[PDB]
């Protein structure tokens, strides 16, 4: 629902 700082270590995009 809100955007985080993703950074290099997150598979936040499924």
């Amino acid at each position, epitope marked *: 629902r*809100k*955007r*985080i*700082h*993703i*950074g*290099p*270590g*997150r*598979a936040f995009y499924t």
Partner: antibody
Amino acid sequence: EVQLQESGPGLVKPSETLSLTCTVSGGPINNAYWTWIRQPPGKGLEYLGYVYHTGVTNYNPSLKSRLTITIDTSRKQLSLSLKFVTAADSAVYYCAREWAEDGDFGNAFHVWGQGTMVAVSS
Amino acid sequence: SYVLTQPPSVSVSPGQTARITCSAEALSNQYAYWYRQRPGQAPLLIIYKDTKRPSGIPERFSGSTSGTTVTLTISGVQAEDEADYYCQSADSSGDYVFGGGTKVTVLG
């Protein structure tokens, strides 16, 4: 179980470079943004930056030009380098873990070291 | 660039509910995070992503979000809750910002 231990010189002269080290134990060096945060006596917290295990960094925009953070994955240690210090840099410097993995807490610092006191003085 | 605005002090009596607000235009599309810091101590994460509690944190600590304002609510406040409470956020670019902190004082 992740524990963080900061080490520093205690005292740095104005205009010199501050060097600190944080040692990580009780957990993996992967899946975390290893973070430096500071707090001047009687004042609030201020973000400094992170390093990821691959060496990727992220800095507070206001301090980027003076700040370098590095990681040694083999020793499970990260280091802070802050150039040209003044009295404004006198603070307790904390090492903290931002967990970065499926199921994490987002952009939060869930474990902190006890901090290391740095005085900038002649 | 953004700044997180929280009151420097909140006073409550024992058994009452303390409410600490943190506000910024940035908070409309950014998560907030709450920390408790006791004197001479490292901060403790109490709320993440606006409303979520870590495992060790009891239900008496609740986070809420409303537009550009987040609120930390502490119910059943006692003397042991006296501490500094910090709000924190991050934007997409990796600009992490802390609020100035709120000192909770328990009266009486």
